[PDB]
Amino acid sequence: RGNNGNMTFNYYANTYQNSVDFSTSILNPLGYLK
Amino acid sequence: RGNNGNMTFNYYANTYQNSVDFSTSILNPLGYLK
Amino acid sequence: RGNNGNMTFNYYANTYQNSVDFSTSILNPLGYLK
Amino acid sequence: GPIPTAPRENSLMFLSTLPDDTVPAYGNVRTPPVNYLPGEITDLLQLARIPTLMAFERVP
Amino acid sequence: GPIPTAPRENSLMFLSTLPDDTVPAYGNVRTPPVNYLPGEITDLLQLARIPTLMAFERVPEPVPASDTYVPYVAVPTQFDDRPLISFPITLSDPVYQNTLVGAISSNFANYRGCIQITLTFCGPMMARGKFLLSYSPPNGTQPQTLSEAMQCTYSIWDIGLNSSWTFVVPYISPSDYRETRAITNSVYSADGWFSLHKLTKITLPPDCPQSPCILFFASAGEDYTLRLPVDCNPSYVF
Amino acid sequence: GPIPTAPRENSLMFLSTLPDDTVPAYGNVRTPPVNYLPGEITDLLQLARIPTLMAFERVPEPVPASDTYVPYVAVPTQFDDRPLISFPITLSDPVYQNTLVGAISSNFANYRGCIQITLTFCGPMMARGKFLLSYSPPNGTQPQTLSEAMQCTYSIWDIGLNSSWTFVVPYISPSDYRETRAITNSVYSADGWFSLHKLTKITLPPDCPQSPCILFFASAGEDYTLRLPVDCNPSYVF
Amino acid sequence: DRVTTQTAGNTAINTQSSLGVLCAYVEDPTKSDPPSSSTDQPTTTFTAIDRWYTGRLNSWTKAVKTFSFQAVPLPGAFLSRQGGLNGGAFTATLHRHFLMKCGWQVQVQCNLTQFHQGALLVAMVPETTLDVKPDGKAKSLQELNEEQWVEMSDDYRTGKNMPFQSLGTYYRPPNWTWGPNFINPYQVTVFPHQILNARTSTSVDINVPYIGETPTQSSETQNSWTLLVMVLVPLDYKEGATTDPEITFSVRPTSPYFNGLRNRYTAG
Amino acid sequence: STDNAETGVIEAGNTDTDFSGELAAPGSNHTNVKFLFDRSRLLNVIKVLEKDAVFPRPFPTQEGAQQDDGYFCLLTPRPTVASRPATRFGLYANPSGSGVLANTSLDFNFYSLACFTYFRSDLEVTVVSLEPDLEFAVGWFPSGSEYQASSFVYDQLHVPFHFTGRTPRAFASKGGKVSFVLPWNSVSSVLPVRWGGASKLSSATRGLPAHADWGTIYAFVPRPNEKKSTAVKHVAVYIRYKNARAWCPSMLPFRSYK
Hints:
This is part of a larger assembly, with three copies of chain A (34 residues), three copies of chain D, one copy of chain G (268 residues) and one copy of chain H (258 residues).
Chain D: E1 5-7, H1 44-48
Chain G: E1 4-8, E2 11-15, E3 53-57, E4 69-72, H1 76-80, H2 89-94, E5 97-108, E6 119-126, H3 154-157, E7 176-178, E8 193-197, E9 204-208, E10 225-230, E11 247-261
Antiparallel strand pairs in G: 1-2, 3-11, 4-10, 5-9, 5-11, 6-8, 6-10
Chain H: H1 33-36, E1 41-47, E2 74-75, E3 80-81, E4 84-85, E5 89-90, E6 104-105, E7 118-129, E8 137-142, E9 151-154, E10 157-160, E11 170-171, E12 179-182, E13 191-192, E14 215-220, E15 234-239, E16 242-247
Antiparallel strand pairs in H: 1-15, 2-14, 3-4, 3-6, 7-12, 7-13, 7-15, 7-16, 8-11, 8-14, 9-10
């Protein structure tokens, strides 16, 4: 999300827009007391 | 490929963009030992 | 043909682009010997 | 011919909050992976509801 | 709001070869019709394969008349063993000054393919001779006498009831396209000389005149293709 | 009316890496064909895994001939307990001056993965010896004698009918990518020294010459990947 | 194993302790096509010339240094006739055809004993000029026996020993440093090659198909595959071993392509 | 292991060739040769024409010649002296004296990656003026052709011909920059970075491929000849390679020791 107005399209493909990762092959709390 | 963001369209037809050839009518290694 | 990149569209209609004619109502050689 | 355009009053400016992105000058790179280390933050409010010790002026 | 845009480095320039069109300042007009007059041109190569008379330096008898340059060959009676006409193939040489393929090549940069030259006899019908014509790719020196022009590539030719002999210089080449003029006379721009020899003497009865004549033509063959124009030579206007 | 637009801050600039193309000023041309000549390159890594002869400083006998630097090892007969060759792994060290992976690494910034070095014997067939080669990740000091190079990671090697022994330095690392040269010789850019020791003496009959020789190669393994180029070093031209 | 009897035309060579083959860039190199740039009927192969020609190269001693090489061009070797090696019928053919096009089998020659050591390096580099010091005259058969080896100076390493041109006396005389043609001896094993030494082999082969800057270069000017032999570690032998072994070579054309008849070549 | 390298061909060996361990993931692909070269790179600078141009001579040239040197740029990566194809590369380190210094050029950082013998691409011409507040014009003619140089008068003003012609021109804006991509035009098949050969059949300098090139760019101001300033000015030229291919690998430039 962030802040964009790009609900139509982006110009470049997303692999030119920002880096993606490798291949190693309603919110949540922060640590319970068991 | 190279580096482009042109996943939508190019403006000119490709015969105006770069030269194409004539008509004479997973990668590979570089020379085996037979 | 000529030299264009306009394989998508032109802006104006063609009657505003260049003049067309009236109504009077693999190439060819240049003159045979009969 | 080119498509006719009309530049509006907002020319060449840059707004700090301007919700858009810019063409990269170098792209198609990869990165180290992420997933191994836990403890993400989606909202700081998951952060904000932790106890915190106040601070007072000492008695005379 | 307007669509966001980013002007690139190419602002407000105009390229000469730029393949696009511009908004008209006055439009919606009509024109007189066209169809009545025939003879269209789609390609100039339909133009380019018409015969054209070559132009040579006159043999050492300079007539003081204007431009003593000659579109034929004066065959001598005397026996000597050097060729009649020998000229190179560089399409800016002073033998290729007003041939068509020379002329519309003189403003282009590169061609590919064959070059027909043919030759039309003109003499009395009771005269008859045997003439061979020969072509050699670039050797070190120039092939001069009949053994050298013999080994290479030739055709002999009769004199009979017809009057010509269509000849086509073959197209051997290092690279497929070739240049049109030689800034440095290299192997890419020249292709060896062309010559024709008299094989047996011209034979003719008494009381008919000596020394017959032969005209030369020069035309594009089938594969002759051009490319990629260049700015012209305005030296005709001065 | 025209479509409303808004030019952003990036006006009329040109980026060097800018992934787009520009309008041609002359187009619709053809080219000579390609297909006849073989041997394409899709990736330079098909290039990068070819053997390459390393280059070392000559032992203290400087021959006054040009560039006394030596692509082999002169094993001595004498018993001493220090290694034969010891060199670090920083891909700009003067032992990695003209190896391929050093050479095409010298203009890139970061790599990932293994580095094969192999070594080809050259000596008389009646000679035979036992040589171990050993590798250690960065300790405080440098591992010097045979216990230290013994504990870490090694392979012993015979002399027989073949002549080599393919060795691969394993790839242990804090971070997955690693640098190519060390501006500050840190743990991220070096990975400990490499050495080889003689384990038992070279053994050879009479009337055959002393002191055999061994050549060194250096090649990329399988996982060796490169990234993200940088401007080059023009110091070869001066 | 290891016995390769190769028969072509009427000749037949075998090297009993050999190693194998080594093609380049395509596993079967002899396949080709007649060139597309020509228009004349090309003169293809014929069985009278499908041949191993052989020819003697210079011998080699103790006194050599590291990286010192011999290098023979091709097909320019056939012209000037080095080492008792001539094309014979083949030169009489390719004098008379302005376009020439062919690929090459080579297997080179030595045989050291079992009490020797020392590594040669047979390799054919593409598209080089390792036969001229910049005077403009290509070196010929007389000036080979005065050196027996090219002592590998720095001027080949920095590309300073390629023939430059007359600068013209309107300018300043320059200060040259670099040329794009060079030899970097720490690097020379990226070409089709195999270490030949007294370890395992005696004679060993390369094989290469065509490469070119154009479909067909000229007859008597181009030189694509110069082959060079260079020593990496020198020989050592006691008094009683066979002094100064001898080197020859064996060159085979495969599928020749001729084009364009004229008179036999006479140099201008 | 226990294979021997004397067969000329050895493969690579992962960690489990002789040790315990598994092979690592492929990181990236900034390696493919039609992506690696695509970088905007200047090769040199250019003195700007302002008059009827004249171009330099063939190989020898005695004194008393009148040419205007350093105005053309025969754009190739190959080494070039005085805007005509040379074979070596100069660096005039002690330039004191008389006799004019030639215009040298070379594409420096291209060779330090180049492990090739034959090359194939298209290029683009990016121009930029270094002096401020300037407006200019770039011209071009293809390889295997040559510049036209004359002048024809219009209303007492001598105007040269390179304002017009067939081959394309380009007029910049107020201190703008001009760029366009440019395709193949060469008579030969692929660009050589090494060559044997000679230009003509005999009596030629062995090594320079005179017609396997690209072309040249010259800069000039849009003014008549008689209104020319006394201060000279400069402009640079940039090339970025495109759609490249490559064939039959080779060595690298030798690094120092030194």
